[PDB]
């Protein structure tokens, strides 16, 4: 009987600042133990500064961008090019993915980009069809091995200011985008060893006013 | 000759040619005028935004359809548009399932097909509406003329609506100079801008009316207005 | 026949022609955008003190930052108003963001720009030509105010002030050079109440006249009675002076 | 997951968590569980959360229609019975709905309607929806009166989403605390239940079950 | 001429069929609506000349659409019993799926629509009927009046009358009635609009049949001899 | 220029007589201009009034 659907293993992950947002992401591509593809990137421009990666079952994910480019085209042509909105692509996507619910699709997709206001923003979504502005959020199996990190560096979730124990909460403080970036590598590179979901390369395609970055690493093969 | 032969789109005349073609080509006529000229590297279309009165905006007559592609009417506006969202349709399937960006002339062989689909039926409408269609292929640029017979020509140059004597004299002049002249985007403009001048009555010259459209081998379909069409005029 | 398979010999087609004068017999609807919101007034056309004025309206708010007034067919208009109220709900429910004035003034003209029964690569839901114009204001944050003049005809044309109705050839030679972007929102009303008085042979009043205006901040606002009411003992006022 | 819901005189007092759990982990602490479907009435995200959220969107549109065709407001009775009507047609869809339409008009008072996913639809004065909702009866029934003032109606919505937080697994967040008043809902601020745990220690000398 | 086509937008802008809608309502039955303060007064003509007729299973011109809803009409019977058909299985459908009893308003909507529809769409002749649907709205004890036109759409007037001798009925309506303030009583109410109705049936006890519709569902058809009673009382006024 | 053959292909069946009121009509419009020349422009007009209907009628979109 074949196979409903596949996996295609992969982690990644989106960081909403106040200014940047990245879209984070190996390029290790697996089916069991073995790498179908030690290079092929996954994290992809839809223009306007939202970027977009549907993690998990690759063949689903393919589909839904593949539909989402060519809504792009007529969202532009019939109301006189409007930027295509951060939450008008959301809305948009929750309806694919509840397009087929009896079976529902198998992809665990996060955009990423700027919200209106002009802070970095990310919207998650679960399979199921949900979607929501979240603050920090990794996707696929290690998703869970990641989000610890995130809550005890930037969060400050379960930190207290030192002499208080406790009186005190240390306070949001925000970051460059450099130090993010650094963030993200040594996340990545711990997971090298601790998953073999993550490794090859590190693909960042980071989107800011300025215009989109790219930005790559290499990653371990063992 | 009202109603009975050649009243209907069946039937014949003895001869066997329809008195409503030549009426759907007088459409074309009452049209707004728009050049339309080609190097071997960029493809230029000149039309003037028609308006009703002052305080009505001058009103885009140059559409564009898709990144690569665009067209300009003139002729019945509501034909126009279920032919223009069709030429849509069909550069998005190439695009998905075999790649390719929709070659200009392919995509002209359907849009004949589609009006001679009325000519054969009971009812329903010939086209009635002529369109310059401009864009950029594996080919390079392209300029087609559909007619309302639904007939695609690959031409250097051609101008349709309102006294196209003017224009179409000065592009057989200018015919050997514009097509030479490639490597140059702004030169092939300039060039567009000298015929209108011909055809119009001098009914306006204002960048406010004129809009200029160019999609080659270097610029993508952009849209001209104001300031950017006001080097050139 | 004479439908729209018959090409008229002209260049036209028979049906375009007859829309017309449907919007030409039409109420009398006058609209003048500023900068600080649109103001649409209209005649009710009261006839008998037995018919109810406030309950009857051509002017009718059709999604939250939009409103419409009518002149034409009053039978094709309901059909007319109820595509216009789906097709914005649509796109709210689906994208779930505020949609431009020209975004809805397309989209409306979309089943407009099609005539006929045959139909070769599309659906038809239509079974008729149909003969009614709007008045299409509102705002979106990206232009601000626009008004449109939608027609059953050609494409749209944006229009900075626009009368239309039996009213309209008169209306219209005034509005060209009264028209002006410096006015405020109140010297504006009482403009719109002035044309209006010419134009209507029975003297102005509240029981047969009716002023709206679109602000984005207090949305599709129908004046009170008594707020129409008094603008109009104000033009009286002024006039007296002038 | 845990929901609760009280009529009284002074309209409703609804409040929910915010924990959504995927597998045995903690996806979330920040679905926000309160639909605003439109400024009159109040959903909830309770039961299949995606379902909800598509599918009260959909209410949306249906209340939007009828509030511009008669021009007046929608009663809770119609929007919820539309919903439970679309529901109970669809299920066998992965449908696994329940929601709590809640509203205060004066065509029927304050007004709770129960959907399913079955297409039951259920009144109350009072329902608790969730996994959670065992334990947030046992506080909520013993203050529950309708002549049961304003004020008090305020922690006691606060309390009953404390207790079920602590016990439940499926369940923290934060504390959404929302009135539907006359007019419509009033948000009432975004309370950290981590954080009120404590206050409430201290208070009343609670939560000496829990060491220390 | 254009009365072959209903697609023809006609450049009269005025499609012939349309026109003979109105020459069908004129010739029915006269039927008048009068509202007062907490009641419409229907008074409305059955004919009852006809020889050797069961008057018993013959139709009440008025027709029960809902239980607080009720229906009079001028215009050709047989085309009328479509309305009345499509318009109680709405009500009742009103019911099922917004749970709301009938909103007389959306069923003034509904029933002009179906005159509509079948304007657009060829092969379907417009009705030659006009109505008054009158009732009483969910959660009100105002009186509801209105009249639907064969033109397709709907209006609601302080008080209105159709059908064959309406010039006459119109000046009574005037003078006697006004939008600024209906008869306060029920009574004042319904002698006038026997008064009315007097003036073109010209004096009958069955010939006139007056249902009067009050608030909560409440329907009760006037009895004869209280008819009668009003004919006597304004016939003594009519030679002073 | 004049260009016969522009002016010969949107004509179909004018006999001789039908050909002269075009050819009068062009130069009627340039009698009005005071130009003794007469511009092709002139002509294509100068047909519409030999035809049925009148000289460039109204149109909706244009």
């Given at each position: 009987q074949f196979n409903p659907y596949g996996d295609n293993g992969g982690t990644i992950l989106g960081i909403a600042g106040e200014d940047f947002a990245v879209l984070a992401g190996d390029t290790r591509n697996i089916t069991d133990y073995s790498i179908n593809s030690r290079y092929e990137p996954k994290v992809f421009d839809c223009g306007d500064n939202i970027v977009m990666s549907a993690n998990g079952f690759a063949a689903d994910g393919d589909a839904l961008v593949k539909r989402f480019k060519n809504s792009v085209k007529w969202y532009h042509f019939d109301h006189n090019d409007k930027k295509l909105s951060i939450n008008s692509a959301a809305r948009n996507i929750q309806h694919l993915l509840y397009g087929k619910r009896f079976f529902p699709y198998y992809v665990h997709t996060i955009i990423a980009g700027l919200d209106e206001d002009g802070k970095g923003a990310v919207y998650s979504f679960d399979p199921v069809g949900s979607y929501e502005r979240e603050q920090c959020r990794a996707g696929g199996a290690a998703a869970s091995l990641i989000m610890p990190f995130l809550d005890n560096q930037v969060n400050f979730k379960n930190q207290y200011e030192p002499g208080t124990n406790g009186k005190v909460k240390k306070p949001l403080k925000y970051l460059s985008v450099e130090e993010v970036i650094k963030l993200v590598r040594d996340s990545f590179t711990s997971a090298t060893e601790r998953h073999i979901q993550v490794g090859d390369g590190l693909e960042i395609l980071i989107v800011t006013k300025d215009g989109v970055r790219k930005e790559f690493y290499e990653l371990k093969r063992d | 000759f009202r109603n009975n032969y050649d009243g209907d789109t069946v039937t014949f005349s003895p001869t066997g040619r329809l008195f409503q073609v030549e009426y759907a080509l007088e459409a074309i006529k009452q049209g707004s005028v728009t050049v339309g000229l080609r190097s071997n590297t960029h493809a230029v279309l000149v039309a003037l935004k028609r308006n009703a009165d002052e305080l009505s905006s001058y009103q885009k007559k140059i559409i564009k359809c898709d990144e690569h592609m665009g067209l300009s009417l003139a002729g019945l506006a509501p034909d126009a548009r279920v032919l223009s969202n069709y030429l849509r349709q069909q550069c998005n399937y190439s695009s998905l399932?075999?790649?390719?960006?929709?070659?200009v002339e392919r995509a002209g062989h359907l849009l004949c097909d589609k009006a001679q689909k009325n000519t054969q039926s009971y009812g329903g409408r010939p086209y009635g509406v002529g369109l310059l269609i401009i864009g950029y292929d594996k080919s390079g640029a392209h300029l087609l003329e559909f007619q309302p017979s639904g007939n695609v020509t690959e031409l250097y140059g051609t101008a349709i609506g309102a006294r196209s004597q003017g224009a179409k004299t000065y592009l057989e002049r200018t015919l050997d100079t514009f097509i030479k002249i490639d490597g140059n985007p702004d030169e092939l403009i300039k060039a567009g801008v000298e015929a209108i001048s011909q055809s119009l009555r001098d009914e306006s010259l204002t960048v406010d009316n004129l809009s200029i459209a160019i999609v080659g081998k270097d610029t993508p379909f952009t849209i001209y207005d104001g300031e950017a069409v006001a080097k050139y005029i | 026949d004479r439908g729209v398979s018959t090409f008229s010999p002209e260049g036209r087609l028979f049906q375009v022609e007859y829309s017309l004068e449907a919007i030409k017999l039409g109420s009398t609807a006058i609209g003048i955008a500023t900068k600080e919101g649109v103001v649409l007034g209209v005649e009710?056309?009261?006839?008998?003190?037995?018919?109810e004025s406030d309950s009857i309206e051509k002017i009718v708010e059709i999604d939250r930052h939009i409103g419409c007034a009518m002149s034409g067919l009053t039978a094709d208009a309901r059909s007319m108003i109820e595509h216009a109220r789906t097709a914005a709900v649509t796109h709210n429910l689906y994208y779930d963001e505020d949609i431009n004035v020209e975004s809805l003034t397309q989209s409306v003209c979309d089943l407009a720009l099609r005539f006929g029964e045959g139909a070769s690569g599309e659906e038809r839901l239509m079974s008729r030509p149909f003969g009614v114009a709007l008045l299409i204001a509102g705002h979106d944050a990206d232009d601000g105010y626009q008004l449109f003049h939608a027609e059953p005809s050609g494409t749209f044309y944006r229009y900075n002030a626009k009368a239309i109705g039996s009213g309209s050839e008169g209306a219209q030679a005034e509005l060209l050079n009264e028209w002006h972007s410096s006015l405020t929102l109140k010297e504006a009303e009482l403009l719109v109440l002035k044309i209006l008085k010419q134009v209507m042979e029975e003297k102005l009043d509240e029981n047969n006249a009716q002023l709206s205006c679109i602000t984005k901040q207090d949305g599709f606002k129908i004046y009170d009675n008594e707020k129409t009411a008094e603008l109009i003992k104000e033009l009286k006022e002024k006039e007296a002076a002038e | 997951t845990t929901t609760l819901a009280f009529r009284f005189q002074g309209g409703i007092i609804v409040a929910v968590d915010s924990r959504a759990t995927a597998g045995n982990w903690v996806a979330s602490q920040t679905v926000k569980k309160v639909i605003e479907i439109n400024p009159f009435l109040l959903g909830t995200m309770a039961g299949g959360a995606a379902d909800c959220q598509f599918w009260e969107t959909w209410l949306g549109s249906q209340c939007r229609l009828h509030e511009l065709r008669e021009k007046e407001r929608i009663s809770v009775a119609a929007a919820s019975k539309i919903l439970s009507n679309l529901v109970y047609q669809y299920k066998g869809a992965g449908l696994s709905m329940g929601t709590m339409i809640c509203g205060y008009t004066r065509k029927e008072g304050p007004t709770i309607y129960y959907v399913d996913s079955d297409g039951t639809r259920l009144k109350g004065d009072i329902f608790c929806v969730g996994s959670g909702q065992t334990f947030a009866y046992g506080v909520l029934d013993s203050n529950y009166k309708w002549d049961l003032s304003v004020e008090d109606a305020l922690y006691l919505g606060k309390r009953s989403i404390l207790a079920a937080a602590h016990r439940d697994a499926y369940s923290g967040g934060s504390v959404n605390l929302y009135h539907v008043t006359e007019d419509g809902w009033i948000y009432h601020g975004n309370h950290d239940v981590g954080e009120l745990f404590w206050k409430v220690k201290e208070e009343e000398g609670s939560f000496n079950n829990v060491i220390g | 001429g254009y009365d072959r086509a209903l697609s023809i937008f006609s450049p009269d802008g005025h499609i012939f069929q349309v026109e003979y809608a109105l020459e069908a309502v004129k010739r029915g039955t006269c039927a008048v609506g009068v509202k007062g303060k907490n009641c419409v007064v229907l008074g409305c003509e059955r004919r009852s000349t006809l020889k050797l007729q069961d008057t018993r299973i013959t139709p009440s011109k008025v027709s029960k659409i809902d239980s607080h809803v009720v229906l009079s009409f001028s215009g050709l019977n047989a085309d009328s019993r479509i309305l009345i058909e499509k318009a109680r299985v709405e009500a009742q459908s009103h019911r099922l799926t917004?749970?709301?009893?009938?909103?007389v308003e959306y069923l003034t909507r509904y029933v002009a629509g179906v005159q509509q529809r079948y304007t657009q769409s060829g092969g379907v002749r417009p009705f030659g009927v006009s109505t008054l649907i009158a009732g009483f709205d969910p959660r009100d004890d105002e009186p509801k009046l209105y009249q639907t036109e064969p033109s397709g759409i709907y209006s609601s007037w302080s008080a209105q009358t159709i059908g064959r001798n309406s010039k006459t009925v119109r000046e009574f309506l005037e003078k006697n009635y006004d939008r600024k303030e209906p008869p306060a009583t029920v009574e004042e109410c319904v002698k006038l609009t026997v008064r009315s109705l007097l003036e073109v049936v010209q004096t009958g006890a069955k010939n006139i049949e007056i249902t009067v519709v009050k608030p909560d569902s409440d329907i009760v058809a006037l009895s004869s001899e209280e008819i009668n009673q009003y004919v006597t009382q304004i016939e003594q006024e009519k030679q002073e | 220029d004049i260009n016969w053959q522009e002016l010969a292909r949107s004509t179909d069946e004018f006999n001789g007589a039908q050909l002269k009121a075009v050819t009068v009509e062009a130069g009627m419009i340039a009698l009005r201009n005071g130009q003794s020349s007469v511009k092709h422009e002139d002509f294509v007009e100068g047909i519409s009034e030999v035809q049925a209907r009148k000289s460039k009628s109204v149109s909706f979109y244009a």
């Open positions: - | 399932v075999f790649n390719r960006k929709l070659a | 009710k056309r009261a006839t008998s003190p037995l018919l | - | 917004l749970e709301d009893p009938v909103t | -």
